[PDB]
RNA sequence: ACAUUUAACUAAAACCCCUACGCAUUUAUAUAGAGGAGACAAGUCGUAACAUGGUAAGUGUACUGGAAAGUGCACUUGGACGAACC
RNA sequence: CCCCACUAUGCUUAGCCCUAAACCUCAACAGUUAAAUCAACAAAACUGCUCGCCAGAACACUACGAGCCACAGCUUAAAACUCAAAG
RNA sequence: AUAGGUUUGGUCCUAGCCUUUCUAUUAGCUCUUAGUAAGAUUACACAUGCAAGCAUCCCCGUUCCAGUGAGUUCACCCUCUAAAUCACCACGAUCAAAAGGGACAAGCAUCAAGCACGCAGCAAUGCAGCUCAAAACGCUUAGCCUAGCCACACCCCCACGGGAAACAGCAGUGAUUAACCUUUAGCAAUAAACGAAAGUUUAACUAAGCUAUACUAACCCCAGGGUUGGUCAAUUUCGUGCCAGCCACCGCGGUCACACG
């Protein structure tokens, strides 16, 4: 561009940041609804345990439940985080192990 | 590279080289230059490397430059009094036409430098505060003076703590 | 820039102003004093434990004057605390007296009248201040003349005071640096400050007033 | 000074907002002689 | 000499002359921008009282500002017609000139 | 002081102009006649031409 | 809308109004129902494209067809025409 | 796809519609051929100046709004979800 | 940025995403001492206690301090001139309102027209103008340019009047949130209020309490957390067998897994 157009247009305008799955926030709250598994895409074959959560934000959403063998059931108090689970396409959240109901995995 | 011919104009360290700083009776400088013809040619250089380093300088005074309004280039100053300086300046160079109005209107050497004297007194060097306006924020940095609680603890009868428990 | 008007915050401060000035609290109401707590009920505040004893054992100005014919206009008032701190004689000469209506005995109001402290006599006559204070004594017709007899003391007093003792080097310092070489020591005139008392009638044109809450 | 369609929309806008005005001021006339009616009568 | 309008003095194209004694004056200052470092013109419209109303569209004026303004808008007076719209006058040699040419020559009075 | 400096340096600066202008004129004068010459021997020719 | 004073041997008293606004207006969430786009290890029908892809491809537009697509008209090369004469 | 037949249509007059691979995909004006000539291919590489336009793919010559003699239209023209490529 | 990984059978170009750096909250696991600094998620609702008195009566003060970030181009400059301080009429100086002028956030033009927004005149009244693609008029977002300033003080911008009964003062509680400090002491220091003053008052403030959020210094006995395919420092043997699982990106695992436990 022209020393005259840059002038006119002025500074980049940064393009709006968009908020993820969590709003922002590092964890949200919230209550198991369903627990269910989900077919990876290709190349790889799994049967991957998730559930979906009602969010303390009122949208509800399926995420992640990390870690050999979860205990959760429905109406059940969980810890969500950010961070994408590659396998599941449109899985953008997982459960905090440790938290609330969600235990620590069993050792071995 | 900076886009344009000579791009060492869009330079803050260019635009700080002006040595004309008018008087404060002078409100508007007008430029009436030729675009054309070699008898003009100092006024078309002056508009084009001069006027940046004078607006620099005079950020309040307004300069409108007028092409090809009249059969030669001429410079005109209006002073607050309403006097009107016109200043021909045909035939001249760039360089002679920056030191010609320096010399009719612009402050002299000895005025500027007493007001940058006049600066140096805002800062004072034994007060004390913010980084942005003091040397130093606090005492404690002063050697030989009892060092900042944070970096070296204070004697326990210094400390509050145990003057009341010694106390009571 | 244009300033939205807001309408509602110069009407309410005209009514405001209008009330304080209609539904104002009377002398009578503002200085009152219940006798046996000594609080003033309008206020609901206890007076100083200082003031208590005179409170009980004096009269307010007006409570002297209600009794006097024209409200002992042109009679001289002292107060029981000038007597006992200055020996010098001080009084008000009345110049007029507002009294309040309202009051069922007519003790309260404002009053007018020339200053003498100490036997020094104001050249003009103004606002009479302290008047609802349990102070005021009423001169005698028969005494005025023996009371206000007062002969003025040598007012010899001393001039000249010297210099702090860093004030003083500077001064001098100046001097010699300028080439200035003067025996002399540096002293202030305090001539021109004069010292009055601490209870010397201030003025009452500027002090202000309780306002209308009423307890 | 402008160069911009003044398209059906604009130009009945453009046209009421003007008749508002010219009937504004009329109103406004009504609303001084009336005032000057009322002035003079009380004296 | 004390004025309570800012600008002082303020040389201005005159761009409208459809209000009664009053001068429609675009002034442009010269003005950084920070980040090119150029100066580009910024352009105020200003109003002015033009009693005699001699003002054409076109022609530059010099405003002095008023002690106090008079108006709403209009804050200054015509002071000056620097140059009126096709009859200008050389400062230089005082003989009229269309454009860049002498109507009259400078050698006709010496 | 300055402004009566600056008004003697445009008197001056005036003096050269008038002298400038005056060596054009003649240059002028010269061209101008030249080409009348010119135009006066087409416009002959050429009326011939027409007649 | 509205109100024009008392009092005066020092100087004071008196003063106090009513109208708005709701299923009006502005934006947004929710949706009986109706559809799109994307994603998705191994579904069905055909084979439109990529080689002259077996009717060269595509653009605009129109009509037509289960479906990719077909055809008309103009335009494009982001196809080719085998590069002396036979 | 090939063959035959025939219509809208291609033509004229009067109004609309306003699109194209409207592409010589290479903007207007003024110069230059010396340096680094120069990613590749194509139609050698650059300078001054100005205006227009472009900022991952797809969603999308789309949705909504606005304008239009257009009413299955044209112009302007997004976002959410998805991907780690697309080119 | 001194850059790095990643498009393909491969190369070059372009390009996005991501890695490595430094902070701030929150979660997991984990924790020894000392000094210092800092310290509800929410302008949501609040039990209880305290936070403004002083003083010979009048006045003055409670309009400050402390708190909050809802709203938001009132903060800066010039002109002008109140209140206020210089014991008081001066005096000018200092300080600083209202008013006039100028300047001064972010995103959106799919907000493109606003709709009375101008001027003249002593007035009457006349004239039809004024702002705007150099972004008017709108919508949305946000306290700011931090020796600090601006704004708010339960709500109706205001607060006569209505709703109605107020901790966005200190400590504390409820609800809410990923977000979690004590219902301590003292007016001895400084600041403020009042007094002519000795002095009185102050949840301002000071000295403590709590908490790995941070900094500094230690520590005789006392170390944990993450990671170990490449980018990127660092794995032995088994188990599992495209399963269970892992992954910031590329990817690993379908019988010999340095990638999972
Ligand atoms: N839009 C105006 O009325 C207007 C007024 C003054 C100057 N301009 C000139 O237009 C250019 C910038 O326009 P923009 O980019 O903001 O417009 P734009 O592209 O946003 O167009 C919006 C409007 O501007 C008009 N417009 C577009 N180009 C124009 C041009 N060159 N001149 C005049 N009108 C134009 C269009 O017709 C339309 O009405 C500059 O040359 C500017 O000086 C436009
Ligand atoms: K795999
Ligand atoms: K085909
Ligand atoms: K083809
Ligand atoms: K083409
Ligand atoms: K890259
Ligand atoms: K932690
Ligand atoms: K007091
Ligand atoms: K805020
Ligand atoms: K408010
Ligand atoms: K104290
Ligand atoms: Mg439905
Ligand atoms: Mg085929
Ligand atoms: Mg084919
Ligand atoms: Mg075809
Ligand atoms: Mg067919
Ligand atoms: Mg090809
Ligand atoms: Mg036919
Ligand atoms: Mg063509
Ligand atoms: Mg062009
Ligand atoms: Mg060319
Ligand atoms: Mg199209
Ligand atoms: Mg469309
Ligand atoms: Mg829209
Ligand atoms: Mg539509
Ligand atoms: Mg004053
Ligand atoms: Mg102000
Ligand atoms: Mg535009
Ligand atoms: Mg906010
Ligand atoms: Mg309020
Ligand atoms: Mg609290
Ligand atoms: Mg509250
Ligand atoms: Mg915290
Ligand atoms: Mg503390
Ligand atoms: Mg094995
Ligand atoms: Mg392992």
Same mark, same amino acid.
């Given at each position: 561009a022209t020393l005259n157009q840059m002038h006119r247009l002025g500074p980049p305008k940064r393009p709006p940041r968009k908020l993820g799955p969590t709003e922002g926030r590092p964890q949200l709250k919230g209550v198991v609804l369903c627990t269910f598994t989900r077919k990876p895409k290709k190349p790889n074959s799994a049967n991957r345990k998730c559930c979906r959560v009602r969010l303390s934000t009122g949208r509800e959403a399926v995420c992640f439940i990390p870690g050999e063998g979860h205990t959760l059931q429905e109406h059940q108090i969980v810890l969500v985080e950010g961070g +994408?689970?590659?396998?599941?396409?449109? %899985?953008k959240l997982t459960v905090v192990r440790g938290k609330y109901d969600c235990g620590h995995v069993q050792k071995k | 590279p900076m886009k344009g011919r000579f791009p060492i104009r869009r330079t803050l360290q260019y635009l700080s080289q002006g040595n004309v700083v008018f008087k404060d009776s002078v409100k508007v400088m007008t430029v009436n230059y030729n675009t054309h013809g070699e008898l003009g040619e100092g006024a078309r250089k002056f508009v084009f490397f001069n006027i940046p380093q004078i607006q620099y300088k005079n950020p309040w005074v307004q300069i409108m430059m007028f092409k090809n309004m009249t059969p030669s280039p001429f410079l005109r100053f209006y002073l607050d009094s309403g006097e009107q300086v016109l200043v021909d300046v045909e035939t001249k160079s760039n360089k002679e036409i920056m030191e010609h109005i320096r010399k009719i209107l612009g402050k002299n050497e000895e005025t500027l430098r007493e007001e940058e004297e006049e600066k140096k007194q805002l800062s004072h060097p034994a007060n004390f505060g913010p980084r942005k306006y003091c040397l130093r924020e606090c005492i404690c940095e002063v050697e030989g003076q009892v060092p900042c609680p944070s970096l070296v603890p204070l004697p326990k009868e210094m400390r509050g703590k145990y003057k009341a428990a010694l106390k009571a | 820039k244009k300033v939205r008007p807001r309408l509602i915050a110069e009407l309410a401060r005209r009514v405001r102003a209008l009330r304080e000035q209609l539904n104002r609290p009377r002398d009578s109401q503002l200085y009152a004093v219940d006798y046996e707590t000594l609080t003033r009920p309008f206020s609901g505040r206890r007076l100083p434990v200082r003031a208590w004893a005179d409170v009980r054992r004096e009269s307010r100005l007006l409570q002297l004057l209600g009794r006097l014919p024209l409200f002992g206009l042109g009679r001289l008032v002292t107060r029981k605390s000038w007597l006992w701190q200055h020996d010098e004689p001080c009084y008000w000469r009345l110049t007029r007296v507002r009294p309040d209506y309202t009051a069922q005995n007519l003790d309260h109001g404002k009053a007018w009248g020339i200053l003498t402290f100490k036997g020094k006599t104001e050249s003009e006559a103004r606002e009479i201040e302290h008047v609802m204070y349990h102070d005021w004594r009423l001169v005698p017709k028969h005494e005025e003349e023996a009371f206000t007899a007062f002969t003025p003391a040598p007012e010899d007093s001393l001039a000249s005071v010297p210099y702090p003792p860093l004030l003083r080097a500077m001064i001098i310092a100046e001097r010699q640096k300028n080439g200035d070489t003067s025996t002399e020591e540096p002293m202030l005139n305090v001539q021109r400050i004069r010292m009055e008392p601490w209870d010397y009638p201030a003025k009452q044109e500027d002090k202000g007033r309780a306002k209308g809450t009423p307890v | 000074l402008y160069y911009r369609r003044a398209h059906r929309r604009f130009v009945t806008k453009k046209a009421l907002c003007i008749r508002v005005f010219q009937e504004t001021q009329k109103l406004k006339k009504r609303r001084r002689a009336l005032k000057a009616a009322a002035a003079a009568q009380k004296q | 000499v004390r004025s309570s309008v800012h600008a002082r003095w303020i040389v201005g194209k005159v761009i409208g002359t459809k209000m009664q004694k009053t001068a429609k004056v675009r002034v442009t200052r010269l003005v950084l921008d920070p980040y090119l470092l150029k100066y580009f013109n910024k352009r105020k419209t200003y109003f002015a009282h033009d009693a005699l109303q001699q003002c054409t569209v076109g022609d530059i004026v010099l405003l002095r500002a008023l002690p %106090?303004? +008079?108006?709403?808008? %209009?804050?200054?007076?015509?002071?000056?017609? %620097?140059f009126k719209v096709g009859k200008v006058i050389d400062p230089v040699t005082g003989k009229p000139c269309a454009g860049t040419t002498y109507l009259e020559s400078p050698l006709s009075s010496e | 002081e300055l402004m009566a400096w600056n008004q003697a340096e445009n008197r001056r600066l005036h003096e050269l102009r008038i002298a400038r202008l005056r060596q054009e004129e003649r240059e002028q004068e010269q061209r101008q006649a030249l080409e009348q010459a010119r135009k006066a021997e087409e416009v002959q020719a050429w009326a011939q031409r027409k007649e």
């Open positions: +994408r689970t590659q396998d599941l396409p449109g %899985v | - | - | - | %106090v303004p +008079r108006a709403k808008h %209009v804050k200054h007076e015509l002071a000056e017609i %620097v | -």
